[PDB]
Amino acid sequence: NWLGGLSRAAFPKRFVFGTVTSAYQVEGMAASGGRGPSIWDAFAHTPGNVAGNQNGDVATDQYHRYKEDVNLMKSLNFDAYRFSISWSRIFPDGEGRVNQEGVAYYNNLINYLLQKGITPYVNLYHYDLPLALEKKYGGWLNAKMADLFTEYADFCFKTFGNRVKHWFTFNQPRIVALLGYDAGTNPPKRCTKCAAGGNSATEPYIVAHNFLLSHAAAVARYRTKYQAAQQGKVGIVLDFNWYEALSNSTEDQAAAQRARDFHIGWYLDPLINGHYPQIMQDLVKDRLPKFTPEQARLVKGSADYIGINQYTASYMKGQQLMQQTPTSYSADWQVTAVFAKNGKPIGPQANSNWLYIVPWGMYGCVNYIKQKYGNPTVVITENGMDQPANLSRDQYLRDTTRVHFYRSYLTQLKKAIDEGANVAGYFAWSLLDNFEWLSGYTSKFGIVYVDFNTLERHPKASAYWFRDMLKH
Ligand SMILES: OC[C@H]1O[C@@H](O[C@H]2[C@H](O)[C@@H](O)[C@H](O[C@H]3[C@H](O)[C@@H](O)[C@H](O[C@H]4[C@H](O)[C@@H](O)[C@H](O)O[C@@H]4CO)O[C@@H]3CO)O[C@@H]2CO)[C@H](O)[C@@H](O)[C@@H]1O
Ligand SMILES: OC[C@H]1O[C@@H](O[C@H]2[C@H](O)[C@@H](O)[C@H](O[C@H]3[C@H](O)[C@@H](O)[C@H](O[C@H]4[C@H](O)[C@@H](O)[C@H](O)O[C@@H]4CO)O[C@@H]3CO)O[C@@H]2CO)[C@H](O)[C@@H](O)[C@@H]1O
Ligand SMILES: [Zn+2]
């Protein structure tokens, strides 16, 4: 069957199914409704930064159309919706004055979701640092971010937490560190070569450390001030793509494990165990910040659940670990990613060049976290694939590859859960075609098609697949 035996009965009782968006990628009204600019507004408005010089000024206009979109997700039998709050829509300068119109938007969205029986899962941050904070403080390079973020989090807890019971602090701090401060291809465009300045060997580590400390501080505030009354939960969202040793050699198995540690362990070892992975300590040395005992105790156990964004997989090839002059976070791993084995590609690519369709990577990642980290509560917070630009409406709607993608990946997730993985939910990226960062509107991740001329929504085949699979 096109469902391939999948249904709600195939997953645990009360397992949560949802869809996901992020504020800058879908809201629009970027310079309206009192919203202050984020680092992404400045970046996207700079010629050459985004495909077609596009930006999120309008995006999908969810700001005006949110009731349509909530009605749609309910009609598709989802239980939950993961979305983010734009920090600069609430605090235009990132601190100080509250934009009441911004608060009203999120109140209206949250209240409508609840009215329609859809549980809000709310990210506080999804790349969209208020521009004022980047300029005034230097953003995530400044340890002061922990205070600034905690104050923002506190406001959101006080204002929405009587209704919102499932929070996340950050989204993919690895990608912020990597693209923002190693490669310099996402804002603030810092790197060793870069015009904005930077240092690809040091700054990614500073940035990751500050995300961890900020997360911990916000959760401490939640727990000491709000949790008794509100009885909700706060986690964090981390990207994890699977790494499989290219061969069974000692060097290749070591390489795969080293890649896992530099990718997910970077955040999970502090969050679960109260220290950075040993291999990162050994190789990165003085460039890896040291948690004080007090900080390590604040960070350890500070996530009520682990959000995992799972998309793809690669093989890893190793070599002799060698003494080398530091150049970058990326180079620190001392591995080589490989995308074929025995002359066969690991999987076909979706529109995004990085996205190889490898359903067994989902099993790989979930099983690994179960076995390595004491089976913490995991929520699959993003999973999905993209179509290319310039197709017809009907070609977008007949998204057979995406149907196959979800069936295959969810079957692999089911396999891991049946083997005892503590997975509490799954969220499809994305509800809607949207603004896909550097790709702008040239990458289509939605289960719902968005016509970017008219802004009309049209559910794709994959949307109806979910509707069938999820019927109560
Ligand atoms: O309907 C609106 C909209 O839908 C779009 O998507 C369609 C798919 O294109 C179409 O293939 C899909 O058909 C499903 C059908 O809904 C299922 O009921 C059926 O399941 C069978 C199954 O094949 C058996 O193996 C199993 O044992 O039993 C069940 C029946 O009980 O599977 C087929 C696919 O093979 O339905 C979607 C939603 O309608 C269309 O693309 C678009 O044209 C429509 O406007
Ligand atoms: O894009 C959809 C959606 O997903 C979330 O973010 C995406 C990013 O958009 C995308 O840039 C990022 O790309 C990763 C890729 O997944 C990794 O496999 C790859 O990893 C490297 C590793 O860093 C190297 O050190 C190692 O040697 O090799 C591996 C494999 O080549 O790195 C690239 C970036 O360089 O993937 C993200 C998801 O993982 C966002 O949440 C959402 O908003 C986006 O819309
Ligand atoms: Zn509008």
- In the structure encoding, which two tokens stand for residue 321, read together? 């670990």
Nearest-CA residue for atom 17 of ligand 2? 354
3 state DSSP class of 114: helix
| Structure token digits, residue 366 | 């979930």
Question: What's the gap in Å between 230 CA and the centre of ligand 3?
Answer: 34
**DSSP string of 217-233, one letter each residue:** HHHHHIIIIIHHHH--E
Cα four-point dihedral sign 33, 34, 35, 36: positive
Computed from CA positions of residues 344, 350, 353, 358, in that sequence, does the dihedral angle turn out positive or negative? Answer: negative
CA-proximal residue: ligand 1, atom 32 (nearest): 2
Atom of ligand 2 nearest to the CA of 172: 41
State how far the alpha carbon of 112 is from the alpha carbons of 76, 124, 154, 168, 275, in Å.
16, 19, 23, 20, 41
Q: Is 446 helix (H, G, I), strand (E, B) or coil?
A: coil
Task: Spell out the domains of the chain, with CATH numbers in brackets.
Answer: 1-472 (3.20.20.80)
Fill in the DSSP letter of residue 54: -
**Residue 472 to residue 280: CA distance in whole angstroms:** 46
Do the bridges between strand 340-341 and strand 344-345 make them parallel or antiparallel, or are there none, so unpaired? Answer: antiparallel
Residue appearing with tokens 């005892």: 420
Q: 409 CA to middle of ligand 1, Å?
A: 19
Q: Which two tokens stand for residue 146?
A: 């922990």
Ligand 1 atom closest to Cα of 468?
16
CA of 69 to the centre of ligand 3 (A): 13
Amino acid residing at 83 = F
Whether cis (ω within 30° of 0) applies to the bond prior to 345 is no
390 lines ligand 1 (CB under 6 A): no
Q: What is the DSSP letter of 352?
A: S
Q: Determine whether the shortest distance from the Cβ of 458 to ligand 1 is under 6 A.
A: no
Question: What is the spatial distance between Cα 17 and Cα 254, in angstroms, rounded to a whole number?
Answer: 35
**Helix or strand or coil: residue 4?**
coil
In angstroms, rounded to a whole number, what is the distance separating the alpha carbons of residues 14 and 470? 12
Which of the 8 DSSP states describes residue 36? P
Residue with tokens 């990614």: 204
CB 143 within 8 A of CB 49: no
Q: Which residues pair with 17 in a beta bridge?
A: 426
Structure-token pair, residue 17:
């199914």
Cα–chain-centroid distance for residue 65? 24
Which residue's CA lies nearest to atom 38 of ligand 2? 239
Contact present, 270 and 296 (Cβ < 8 Å): yes
To one decimal, the resolution in angstroms is 1.9
User: If you compute the radius of gyration of the chain from its CA atoms, what whole number of angstroms results?
Assistant: 21
Residue 240 Cα: closest atom of ligand 2? 39
Among the bound ligands, the one closest to the CA of 468:
1
Q: Atom 15 in ligand 1: which residue has the minimum CA distance? A: 2
DSSP string, 378-435: EEEEE----B-SS--HHHHH--HHHHHHHHHHHHHHHHHHHTT--EEEEEEE-SB---
Contact assessment for residue 408 and residue 347, using Cβ atoms and an 8 Å cutoff: no
CA atoms within 13 A on the CB side of 69: 30
Under 8 Å CB-to-CB from 447, ≥6 apart: which residues?
19, 76, 384, 399, 402, 428, 430, 431, 459, 460, 462, 463, 466
Of 168, 354, 405, 430, the one to substitute when testing ligand 2's pocket (max ligand atoms within 8 A of C-beta) is 354
Helix (H, G, I), strand (E, B) or coil at 91: coil
Angle at 94 between CA 92 and CA 96, to 5 degrees: 85
CB of 416 within 8 A of CB of 422? no
Expressed in angstroms and rounded, the spacing between residue 239 Cα and the centre of ligand 2 is 8
**3-class SS at 270?**
helix
One DSSP character per residue, 296-349 reads HHHHTT--SSEEEE---EEEEE-----------HHHHT--EEE-EETTEESS-B
Ramachandran bin of 34, using left for φ above 0, alpha for ψ from -120 to 50, beta for the remaining angles: left
Distance CA 435, CA 455 (A): 13
CB 330 within 8 A of CB 342: no
Place of tokens 């009520």: 304
CB of 449 closer than 8 Å to CB of 463: no
Cα gap 252→317, rounded to integer Å: 5
Decide: 1 in ligand 1 pocket, CB within 6 A: yes
Ligand 1: does its nearest atom lie under 6 Å from the Cβ of 467?
no
Q: Which of 117, 124, 145 is nearest to 213 (CA)?
A: 145
Token pair for 222: 């939640």
Q: Which amino acid is at 136?
A: K
List phi, psi (to 5°) of 169: -80, -70
Nearest CA to ligand 2 atom 13: 354
Q: Which residue in 126, 293, 305, 153 sits closest to 219, CA to CA?
A: 153
Residue type, 175: I
DSSP letter for each residue of 135-202:
HHH-GGGSTTHHHHHHHHHHHHHHHHTTT--EEEEEE-HHHHHHHHHTS--STT--SSS-TT---TTT
Experimental method: X-ray
**How far away, in angstroms, is 354 Cα from ligand 2 center?**
7
The span from the CA of 116 to the CA of 227, in Å, is 25
CA 317 to centroid of chain Cα atoms: 26
In the reported structure, the alpha carbon of residue 95 is separated from the centroid of ligand 2 by a whole-number distance in angstroms of 30
From the number of C-beta atoms within 10 Å of its C-beta (0-12, 13-18, 19+), residue 100 rates as exposed
Tally of CB atoms within 10 A around 212: 26
- Ligand 3 centroid to Cα of residue 59, in Å, is 10
DSSP state, 261? Answer: I
Asked if residues 101 and 92 have their Cβ atoms less than 8 Å apart, the reply is no
Residue 94 main-chain phi, psi, to 5 deg? 85, -10
Q: CA of 152: how far to CAs of 26, 111, 223, 226, 281, in Å?
A: 21, 21, 15, 14, 32
Q: Which helix (H) or strand (E) holds 26?
A: helix 23-26
Tokens for 266, please give them.
Answer: 């970077």
HSE-CB for 126 with a 13 A CA cutoff: 24
Give the DSSP H/E element, type plus range, for residue 361.
helix 360-372
The length of the chain is 472
Give the ligand 2 atom nearest the CA of 262. 25
Written as six digits, the tokens of 250 are 């000692």
The 10 Å Cβ neighbour count of residue 301 is 14
Q: Give 353's contacts (C-beta < 8 A, 6+ positions apart).
A: none
Ligand nearest, relative to CA of residue 61:
3
